[PDB]
């Protein structure tokens, strides 16, 4: 394909196919209830990025959306991946802070409407309006994140200096992760146009690997503690 | 904005909004497990109309769709927020009257049914069908509401006279209300048109501020009961 | 209707509507709480299928897609249908060979994605590419029917030789069942056109009745064992 971000998608796509391979044999020799649960979850993650990634190189995830004098180039298919992945990965991590149903429910619906309010503002006509999406879609995040700050560490103590400080860099690559997503939303081409869609492409495709594989083996690992 | 409704939904998006943020405040101070489900819900629920009647009042959840020659204006974005919000009531009504899990997935997978019909009634392109998927949506309410009716009266007793006859205060208010959906639909713009768009507008308003502010100032309240 | 599968959806949507009926009485008189969920799962399945069918039989859920050089006639409804009814009928068989939390969201989630992908090719506008997105939905279902094969596998065993020997031919059943949609997506208007499109709607739809309502029946059945 013709279309500077071929590479990048091309990328994401092998990646996110190796990672989910790497993870369905590795959980393969899983029995325990509970090594299973986030075994399905650490897999599935990347196997949805990996459709959607293909969707977008393949040119299905893209559509056009006229706004500021002009027909720009958006990529719905990501709001897809997000809309599933993103539970998915809260879901782990509340798992893992044993965190109670109810926070699980707030988290969750919040996290949805993070990433319902993203699509419409990716898919809104009216330039300024995009903004207003940007921050309800931003002030769901912070709800987000803030209820994850409490949830790691309100386990981070419970355990020991030496493992108590650790799933406190698992807290913290988290938050500052996630923090990078509206960031590169606001100066993309979605957002603003300041950085180019190709750079916007890169940039997405770096995090999205970051934190469904290179993550997910950070979660996966990181059991005992 | 000069469409006539953007009043009603200019006063939907006002309303919502104060009501989330004061089910955010007010849920602060909660560390029970089981108040904090009933929270989570509670606060969701405005949450998700807020954005709705933000994207109708912004024009987004607006469109054109063409039956009995002309081309109609249908909100499709309501049914987008009673397709989370409904499931959300009744998972709040269903953990009150502590009812099975079973019963929570008849009366959820009924009330996706109902809302599901009830978007493809209002986009249908043919007149005399709409009301056909209006009938088959209202079936799936009468469900619905009979499911609850003998939750709540199944409850209410075991209950003292005085508490007893109360929860049917609640039962009672949510099964009337309910009810005004599809006379509202069927009398209003999408159903018949005997009721102008800007009333069909304020009837919805006034019905959904009812179900999720007010109600659930009230639903969460009573507890004790 | 003159469109030649009109009486193949009208038979469906007959069908469905029977058989669901059939399940909403049948399941009065039920107080277990997991007979209740086997009941609400088994008679919500038919009942979204009715929707779909009459949906399809009445236009709505029928769509023009272009690919090969021409305006094909895609029925997306349909996924819409899988969508929650494939969901559905692996809870009622997780359940009962009583599998684990982990095994459900695995099983559920590789469900989504085969659905997903199934729809994405089914409204692919490059030809070739429809049997990427084929070729990955069958994997995914490999998968499921992988999961399932030792699930009951698994639990078939545990049973005496007459009623272990049996939870083998719904084992059994379910899988050859399954595993005709691919090849039946693959022949027909979707995938090759080797077989005409009223044919495929013949196929799908001897399919879908065998599948919730047919099954259903030995599947609800079929309890004590
Ligand atoms: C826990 C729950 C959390 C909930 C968070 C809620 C927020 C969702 C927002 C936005 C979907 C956008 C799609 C928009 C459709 O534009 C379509 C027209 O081109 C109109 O569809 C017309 C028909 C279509 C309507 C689709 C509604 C689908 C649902
Ligand atoms: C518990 C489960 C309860 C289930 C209840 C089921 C009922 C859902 C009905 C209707 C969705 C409407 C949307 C309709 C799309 O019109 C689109 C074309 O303009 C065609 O989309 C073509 C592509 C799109 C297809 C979308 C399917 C989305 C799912
Ligand atoms: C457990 C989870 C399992 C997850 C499995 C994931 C796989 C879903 C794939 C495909 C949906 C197709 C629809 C496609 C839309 O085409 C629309 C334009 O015509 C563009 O919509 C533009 C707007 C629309 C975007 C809709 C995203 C809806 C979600
Ligand atoms: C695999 C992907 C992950 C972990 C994605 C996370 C995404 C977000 C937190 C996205 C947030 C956004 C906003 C806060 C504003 C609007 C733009 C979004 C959707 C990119
Ligand atoms: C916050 C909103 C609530 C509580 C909404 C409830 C909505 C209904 C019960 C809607 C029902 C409808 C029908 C029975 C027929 C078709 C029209 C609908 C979707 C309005
Ligand atoms: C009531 C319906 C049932 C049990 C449907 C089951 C459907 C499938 C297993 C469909 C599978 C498909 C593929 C593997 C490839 C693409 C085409 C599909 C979606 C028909
Ligand atoms: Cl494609
Ligand atoms: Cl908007
Ligand atoms: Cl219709």
């Given at each position: 394909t013709g279309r500077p971000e071929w590479i990048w998608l091309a990328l994401g796509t092998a990646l996110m196919g190796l990672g989910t391979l790497y993870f369905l044999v590795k959980g393969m020799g899983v029995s325990d209830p509970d090594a299973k649960k986030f075994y399905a979850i650490t897999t599935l993650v990347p196997a949805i990025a990996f459709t959607m990634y293909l969707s977008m190189l393949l040119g299905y995830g893209l559509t056009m959306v006229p706004f500021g004098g002009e027909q720009n180039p958006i990529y719905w298919a990501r709001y897809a991946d997000w809309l599933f992945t993103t539970p998915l990965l809260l879901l782990g991590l509340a798992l893992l802070v044993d965190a109670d149903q109810g926070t699980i429910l707030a988290l969750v619906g919040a996290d949805g409407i993070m990433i319902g309010t993203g699509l419409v503002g990716a898919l809104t006509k009216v330039y300024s309006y995009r903004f207003v999406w940007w921050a309800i879609s931003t002030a769901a995040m912070l709800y987000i994140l803030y209820v994850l700050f409490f949830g790691f560490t309100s386990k981070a103590e419970?355990?020991?200096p030496e493992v108590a400080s650790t799933c406190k860099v698992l807290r913290n690559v988290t938050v500052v992760l996630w923090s990078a997503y509206p960031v590169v939303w606001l100066i993309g081409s979605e957002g603003a146009?300041?950085?180019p869609l190709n750079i916007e492409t890169l940039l997405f495709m770096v995090l999205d690997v970051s934190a469904k594989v290179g993550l997910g083996l950070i979660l996966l690992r990181s059991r005992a503690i």
């Amino acid at each position: 394909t013709g279309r500077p971000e071929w590479i990048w998608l091309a990328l994401g796509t092998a990646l996110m196919g190796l990672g989910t391979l790497y993870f369905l044999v590795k959980g393969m020799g899983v029995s325990d209830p509970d090594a299973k649960k986030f075994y399905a979850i650490t897999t599935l993650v990347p196997a949805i990025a990996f459709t959607m990634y293909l969707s977008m190189l393949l040119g299905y995830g893209l559509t056009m959306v006229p706004f500021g004098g002009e027909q720009n180039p958006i990529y719905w298919a990501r709001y897809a991946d997000w809309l599933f992945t993103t539970p998915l990965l809260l879901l782990g991590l509340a798992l893992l802070v044993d965190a109670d149903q109810g926070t699980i429910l707030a988290l969750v619906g919040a996290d949805g409407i993070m990433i319902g309010t993203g699509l419409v503002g990716a898919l809104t006509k009216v330039y300024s309006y995009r903004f207003v999406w940007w921050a309800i879609s931003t002030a769901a995040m912070l709800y987000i994140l803030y209820v994850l700050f409490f949830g790691f560490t309100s386990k981070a103590e419970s355990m020991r200096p030496e493992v108590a400080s650790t799933c406190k860099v698992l807290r913290n690559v988290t938050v500052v992760l996630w923090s990078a997503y509206p960031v590169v939303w606001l100066i993309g081409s979605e957002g603003a146009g300041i950085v180019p869609l190709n750079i916007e492409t890169l940039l997405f495709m770096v995090l999205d690997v970051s934190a469904k594989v290179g993550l997910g083996l950070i979660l996966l690992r990181s059991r005992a503690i």
